[PDB]
Amino acid sequence: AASQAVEEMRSRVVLGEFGVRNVHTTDFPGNYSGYDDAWDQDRFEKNFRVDVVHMDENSLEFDMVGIDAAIANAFRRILLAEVPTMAVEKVLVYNNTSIVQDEILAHRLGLIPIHADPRLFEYRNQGDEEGTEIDTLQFRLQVRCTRNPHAAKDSSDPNELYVNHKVYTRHMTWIPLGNQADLFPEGTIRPVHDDILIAQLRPGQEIDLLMHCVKGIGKDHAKFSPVATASYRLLPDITLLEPVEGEAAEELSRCFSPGVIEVQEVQGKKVARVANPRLDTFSREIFRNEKLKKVVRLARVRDHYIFSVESTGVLPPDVLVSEAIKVLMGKCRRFLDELDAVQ
């Protein structure tokens, strides 16, 4: 029926063997015969819900329902590029004698994530090489490598022969500027991981330097981005057009991810039903089989996103999404101010 085809066309991204169909968003006023797709704030506030399905340290998965791609992709892009963090930009090097080149060492120290909460610091102004309490942190790395005064006669392995032959990010000591030592309790300003190798030494070699962490967004440089990866996927709804029984139920449960099709016994007979279509990765193995291409409709619900935000440790991911939403609110607020300034 024409009406049934229209409903699929405006509500399901369907996956073919050779290409995806119904990709674009179409629910705009005048695109359809009887539908009234004009903006209605009450219809939005009714349908929209958020379900947090998993959360722990550094990871978060949640569902947004009823929002469009043009806004969910804005949240994805803010988290990558426009949420600010604190990262090293200047390294002042005194007596680097390691094999690691100074330009390579400075690049590595930039990429270490710093646990400093970026809301408490301002942007450093143009120029201003020193900076101040308001807008910079400071770290001091200083490692000297020496021989171990006692060692077994075989003397084979580095971890016995030498001490400080590996530099680790735990050697970074925070150096407070101004009243920062009272505002932050001890241990708050630290590198996150406590195990990142930077250099690697041999006795007589020395590293002494001084870092300056400032605030910046991820559009500038990629060491400022707070997310491991931030992405989304539309939710699958794999549907069975004809009942698949017998020993075709087993081979239908192996053309998918290992937890979505269940085979159940109803009369001592195996019938297959979809159980958890969320766990499907869409490897499209139902189209290699020749008998079962015509019993499934691999699809995607358009207005149901499954966000996955993995943080790098600067601030937890529930605060990251809240900060990201405020940035888009801030972008809209700025141009409203300039329409008021002109008119």
Partner 1 sequence: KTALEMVQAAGTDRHCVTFVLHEEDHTLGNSLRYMIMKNPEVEFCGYTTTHPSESKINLRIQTRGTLPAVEPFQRGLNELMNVCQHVLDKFEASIKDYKDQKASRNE
Partner 2 sequence: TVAVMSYSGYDIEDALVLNKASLDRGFGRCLVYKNAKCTLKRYTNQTFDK
Partner 3 sequence: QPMIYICGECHTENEIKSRDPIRCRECGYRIMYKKRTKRLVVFDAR
Binding site for partner 3 (CB under 8 A): 87-97, 102-103, 106-107, 109-110, 204, 211, 221, 223
Nearest to 13 by CA among 233, 325, 218, 294: 233
Q: Is 303 in the site for partner 1 (CB under 8 A)?
A: no
Contacted entry of partner 1, partner 2, partner 3, none for residue 225, CB cut-off 5 to 8 Å set by kind: partner 2
CB of 21 or CB of 107, closer to partner 3 = 107
Closest CB to partner 2 among residues 110, 236 = 110
Query: Which of partner 2, partner 1, partner 3, none has residue 22 at its interface (CB below 5 to 8 Å by kind)?
Result: none
| 110 vs 191 by CB, closer to partner 2 | 110
Within residues 32-61, the interface with partner 1 by CB under 8 A covers: 37-39, 41, 44-45, 48-52, 55
Q: What does the block give as tokens for 276?
A: 């958890």
Residue 310 touches partner 1, criterion: CB under 8 A:
no
For the chain, the helix, strand and coil percentages under 3-state DSSP, each to the nearest 5: 25, 30, 45
Interaction residues for partner 1, span 243-272 (CB under 8 A): none
Contacts 24+ apart (CB under 8 A), 166-170: 166/197, 166/200, 166/201, 167/141, 167/143, 167/197, 167/198, 167/199, 167/200, 167/201, 167/207, 168/194, 168/195, 168/196, 168/197, 168/198, 169/112, 169/193, 169/194, 169/195, 169/196, 169/198, 170/194, 170/195
Q: Which residue type is seen at 311? A: S
Can you give the C-alpha Rg of the chain in angstroms? 28
Residue 125 in the binding site for partner 1 (CB under 8 A): no
Residues that bind partner 1 (CB under 8 A): 25, 28-30, 37-39, 41, 44-45, 48-52, 55, 62, 64, 67-68, 70-71, 73-74, 77-78, 81-82, 318, 321-322, 325-326, 328-329, 331-336, 338-339, 342-343
